[PDB]
Amino acid sequence: SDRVAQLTIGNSTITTQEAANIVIAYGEWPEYCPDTDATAVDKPTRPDVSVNRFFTLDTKSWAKDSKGWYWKFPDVLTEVGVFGQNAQFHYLYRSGFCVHVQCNASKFHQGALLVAVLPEYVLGTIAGGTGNENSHPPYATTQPGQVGAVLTHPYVLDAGIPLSQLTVCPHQWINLRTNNCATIIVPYMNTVPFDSALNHCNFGLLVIPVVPLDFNAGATSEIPITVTIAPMCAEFAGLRQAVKQ
Amino acid sequence: DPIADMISLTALQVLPTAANTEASSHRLGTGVVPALQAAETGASSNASDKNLIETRCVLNHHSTQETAIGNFFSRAGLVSIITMPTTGTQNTDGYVNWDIDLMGYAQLRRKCELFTYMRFDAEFTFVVAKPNGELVPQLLQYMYVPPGAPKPTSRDSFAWQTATNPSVFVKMTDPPAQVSVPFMSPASAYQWFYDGYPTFGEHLQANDLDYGQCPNNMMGTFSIRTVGTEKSPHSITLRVYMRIKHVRAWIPRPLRNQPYLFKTNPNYKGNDIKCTSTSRDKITTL
Amino acid sequence: ETGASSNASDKNLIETRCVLNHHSTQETAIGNFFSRAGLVSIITMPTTGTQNTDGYVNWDIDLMGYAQLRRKCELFTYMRFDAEFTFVVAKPNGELVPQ
Amino acid sequence: LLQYMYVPPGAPKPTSRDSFAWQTATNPSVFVKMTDPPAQVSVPFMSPA
Amino acid sequence: HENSNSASYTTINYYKDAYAASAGRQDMSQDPKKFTDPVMDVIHEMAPPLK
Amino acid sequence: HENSNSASYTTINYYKDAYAASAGRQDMSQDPKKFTDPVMDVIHEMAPPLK
Amino acid sequence: GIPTELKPGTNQFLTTDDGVSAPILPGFHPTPPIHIPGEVHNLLEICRVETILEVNNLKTNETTPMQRLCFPVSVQSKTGELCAAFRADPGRDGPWQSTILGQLCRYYTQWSGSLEVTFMFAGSFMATGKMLIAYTPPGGNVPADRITAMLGTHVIWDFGLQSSVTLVVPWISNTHYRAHARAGYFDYYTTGIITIWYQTNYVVPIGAPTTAYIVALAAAQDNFTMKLCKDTEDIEQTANIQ
Amino acid sequence: GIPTELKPGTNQFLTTDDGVSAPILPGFHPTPPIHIPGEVHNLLEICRVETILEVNNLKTNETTPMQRLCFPVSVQSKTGELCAAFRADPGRDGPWQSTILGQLCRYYTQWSGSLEVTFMFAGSFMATGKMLIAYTPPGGNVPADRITAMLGTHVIWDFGLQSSVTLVVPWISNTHYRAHARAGYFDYYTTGIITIWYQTNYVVPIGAPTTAYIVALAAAQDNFTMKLCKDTEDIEQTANIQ
Amino acid sequence: GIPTELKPGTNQFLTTDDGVSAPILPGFHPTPPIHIPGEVHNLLEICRV
Amino acid sequence: ITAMLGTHVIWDFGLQSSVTLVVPWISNTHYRAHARAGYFDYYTTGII
Ligand SMILES: CCO/N=C/c1ccc(OCC[C@@H](C)CCN2CCN(c3ccncc3)C2=O)cc1
Ligand SMILES: CCO/N=C/c1ccc(OCC[C@@H](C)CCN2CCN(c3ccncc3)C2=O)cc1
Ligand SMILES: [Cl-]
Ligand SMILES: [Cl-]
Ligand code: NA
Ligand code: NA
Ligand code: NA
């Protein structure tokens, strides 16, 4: 009654028999932009079921020495399904998201993944090691797309901030002996009512193994981690020709 | 009707004092287990003193007012040092243009970066003197040059006519000048972190310096000069202090734990990654 | 040709949503546009040289000597107003003496 | 021009005339000239007892 | 009266613009729950948070 | 009271002459029509302005 | 005397400070006012008035500036040709600089609202034709062809007794306000691009000019406002004014 | 003029003084606010959130910092062994420095209230065991053995479906508030010591790792407050920031 | 500004003057008091012993 | 990543041994005749 759950939206349904509740980021549900906050005057387009449905991105392999991964929203979907198309044809965009990270093992495996949502996840470089080089992250690192990227220094989240404090953000743990997934519902967060789905990532999703994976030789060693996400209340405005970036 | 298909669990409370403690006795039973939790849910423990031990009653009158974000931020702090030397490398022309950026000093920066978005008014105080702290009878002009307005190019530039821009004329011997500044962003709040790019187009390594730059935070230029057609014989140091007031903050984040390297980004010294906490020899000894 | 500006609005040419616009119109009131002190004259009184070394100067009042403030006023044909005059005085190099 | 700063127990004490501590972003500081009248401020009861 | 142009109730002011006003006394409102217990099925304090 | 010698409602003053008063809060009155539609036969927004 | 304490700010002179100053002529009475037509109260009143847009702002026009006040249209032999293009950015260097709206909005740092551009055809009565005027929101460069521009906000104009047509440039922005757009970081505030295409063709019978002109007039709509007063770039004092 | 008399304090600039200052832009109106999730009003809201405690803060970890975020437990051959120990002092150098609570309370001179530490077991489902977590109030050094630690405030934790357990560090002090504890006179404010012992043993069947880890999360309870705002030690500006 | 005139006494510091001074810690709250025997209010109480 | 774009269910093994994939009636015609290679492929239901 708290470990079992079903998420149905659009023409997609997700099930799980070993959940650990669901988190509503900052206690707020996604919602279309009201007339008091809106500023752009054109009537928005709200595709509904064609874009607010679950999308499953590539799977990652959890190894005994994995550092962790991260994805950026809405970057991950800017080129997938009808959502991507609306994101490319419109200047303005806004929406919430239902993030469902999946990972199952056996009652003999062990390990804990911290799944968190960090809004405005700005990355930094190691500054050439010495700190005298003012280098910057490449486009491929700031917006890794659907494939996601790997963290090089998880301890400081590749941004000079302690991973030990990441729990101050909406999050769940996927502790193999307890649950096999994490679910976080994220509302739209920005200083503006709508924004470019191409030039700005509202938040990043981080999956980091704080407690390394471990198992005895002989047990299945391919332990994948899959990410399935669903836009919620997706709105679009400022229609024109398609633009990829 | 021809087509049928076409048809916050958190509230604020006023807590002026710390929670009291109710007296509790011993609990010996099954089914109920307050001590056991499931951190996986993402929730913090709800266990309280009385659930784990026998407590007495404590009428706690401890105030919670000093930790209100308002009292945490409304303390003037250094955000800029503008020097204007008479002889040397820097501007010996008697005028200086400074692009407004409050990320040049650590103390105040680390406090602001505790949050993602912040909206506020500010009180700016200008402490001016000679490099050695002495004071002389010198007349100065401070001018705010908003984005798009012509920046002065010399000590006699027409821009100093300041017919529309706001200017402050004061003597180095007067008390520090002080003025209030409103919330001026085109957006609804300033943001210390902007995970994106300012414009469209390809983002080649040649222009990667664009990453993280949000015009909504660029408030313009602060220009200063000595009032006169002739050069002044005095070196001048201007220390600018900012005091946040009428503040609102959104989305807390992990506090900076690596030294700051640059104003415009979170880059850290890769070869020397400091540990958030000091170390010891064994885990079983203090 | 009538001499009138277009009366067409957003909703006449496109499909619009509702926007409750709270944007203030107060800063464009002529009062806030003009009530900002600006330079209108520089009167020098040198000790040695060409100009008045006699210790006194007569200046005929004319505010059209400086562009910034002049261009703003010339936006209108007629103007009626009171004015606050401030006098900033110092030596040519910006120093101050007990004079 | 002088600067007086109150450094509560646990806060970093300045080690030089240019120590970062003088940024006084949180500690209370008083800036005053030797030619101004004597600076004056009120201090509350600060003991933990 | 004055212009309501403050960035954001017991403040002091002598100018026509509200943002010129002092900081005033800070209020003691709080909402820890949005950060400490942002879960759908509000977990109780007696029975185990998972069952 | 004071002398009504101001060049022209929520101002401040400490002298007997009104023009010494501050600028005060500016009013938001407007009349665009005299500049944007100074025509005799007020042209509508639906039918063509000439017929 | 009453106990007082001077605070920071003392003696300073803020040019925008709205205080009180001693009157020089006690008991003086200004000449009474008399009625005068044309009083204005808010710059927004002037911003709503259409002024000529210099769409044809070429380098080869500078010596004969009158030619910048109107652009041409003429009999085409090819279809779907581009007639003209310009940015919609009202406070940016370019065609808008010639409008009272552009000049006035340069006295403010930020602006918000819908714009409006009315095109008046000044060809002969016998000439006819249909034009496609489009407004492309931020993101896409000047549309390569008509079939691409057609995907944005647009109006298909038909010549007739009604000499003019109005293209509405609806406020479509992410931020409630925009600062003036320039190359670089501030291009984040660009409004977009306006392009004029031949929907059909400029057709004319024997005896009528095969080339005519169009005058572009621009102004702001009722939801337009500006804020953060600043000095303009459009005026300088290179030399002294004798 | 009105008789006044300037008092001591005149001309001074107190950085915490909450006065009034002249506005630079008369009539200016800020961009209206819009709803944004996650607003905070009091730092106490953040202090109540659990963050990871670096209990395993060894010198041999520094080059591989991820290992400090969790400590181990494993099959013992001896009984009543000590698993780990650390001070409870939230504002002292040590494990608490990694928590948002520790960092934030370093911006204040004094603190008061009960603390809370939740331990999450990350071993395999097949592993079981019972641990004795104890809190020793000021006075006694690290307890020599379990039979001594057992005399203080403690919880006996049993592994099962509930991965975590909570050790309450009840506020037990002589003074209403404590300043940050350090070696020397200020040790008078020390909170005490936390030690984790093996109540039984970490038992596991064939096929499961004989070593697993525990993550420690800490935060403040509802009766926690801080006072006397001060600058932190945890941030310095060694060099200039370009 | 309001017309004022500084009078003799200006800038002086009288050690017994009972005026008001700016507080250094806004919003600070002293540790609550607790009952303690032996409170005295007037030196005359001691003189009678 | 392509199949995921259609109607689908993500099944998780546990105490509940089974899961149900609904093949919702999505057709142009109210009825379908039996599908075969050729003209009648017009009535094909789809792929699982
Ligand atoms: C008459 C002259 O007096 N004017 C003084 C003055 C002082 C400050 C002025 O603007 C100050 C803007 C700051 C309150 C906020 C600056 N911000 C906003 C966020 N931001 C920033 C910096 C680096 N990265 C992200 C954001 C900033 O640096 C303008 C005029
Ligand atoms: C005790 C001494 O303080 N008195 C100061 C003072 C300052 C200004 C004074 O008169 C100022 C008149 C201005 C407000 C208007 C001058 N005008 C009116 C219009 N006008 C002008 C100039 C050039 N062409 C057309 C009109 C002007 O130059 C008189 C006294
Ligand atoms: Cl000048
Ligand atoms: Cl300094
Ligand atoms: Na005055
Ligand atoms: Na002041
Ligand atoms: Na005093």
Author numbering:
A (entry chain B): 10 to 254
B (entry chain A): 2 to 8, 19 to 297
C (entry chain A): 51 to 149
D (entry chain A): 150 to 198
E (entry chain D), F (entry chain D): 13 to 20, 27 to 69
G (entry chain C), H (entry chain C): 1 to 242
I (entry chain C): 1 to 49
J (entry chain C): 147 to 194
Show passages lifted from the paper.
The crystal structure of CVA16 in complex with the uncoating inhibitor GPP3 was determined by crystallography. To this end, CVA16 crystals were soaked with the inhibitor dissolved in DMSO because GPP3, like most pocket-factor analogs, is rather insoluble in water. Data were scaled together, merged and the structure solved at 2.75 Å resolution by molecular replacement using the structure of the mature CVA16 virus. The electron density map revealed that the compound replaces the natural pocket factor (modeled as sphingosine) with only a negligible shift (~ 0.2 Å) in the polypeptide backbone of the residues lining the pocket, reflecting its shape similarity with sphingosine. The surface area accessible to solvent, calculated by Areaimol, is 12.3 Å2 for GPP3 in the VP1 pocket whereas for the sphingosine it is 11.8 Å2. This demonstrates that GPP3 is buried within the pocket. As expected, GPP3 binds with its pyridine ring close to the entrance of the pocket, with the carbonyl oxygen of the imidazole moiety hydrogen-bonding to the backbone nitrogen of residue Ile113, which is also the case for sphingosine, and with the phenoxy ring sandwiched between two hydrophobic residues (Phe135 and Tyr155). This binding mode was also observed for EV71 in complex with the same compound, except that EV71 has a phenylalanine at position 155. The docking of GPP3 in the crystal structure reproduces exactly the experimentally observed pose with an energy of interaction of -66 Kcal/mol, expressed as a sum of van der Waals and electrostatic energies. We investigated the interaction of GPP3 with CVA16 by determining the crystal structure of it in complex with the whole virus particle and identified the key residues involved in the interactions with the capsid binder including Phe135 and Tyr155 which make a hydrophobic sandwich with the phenoxy moiety as observed for EV71.
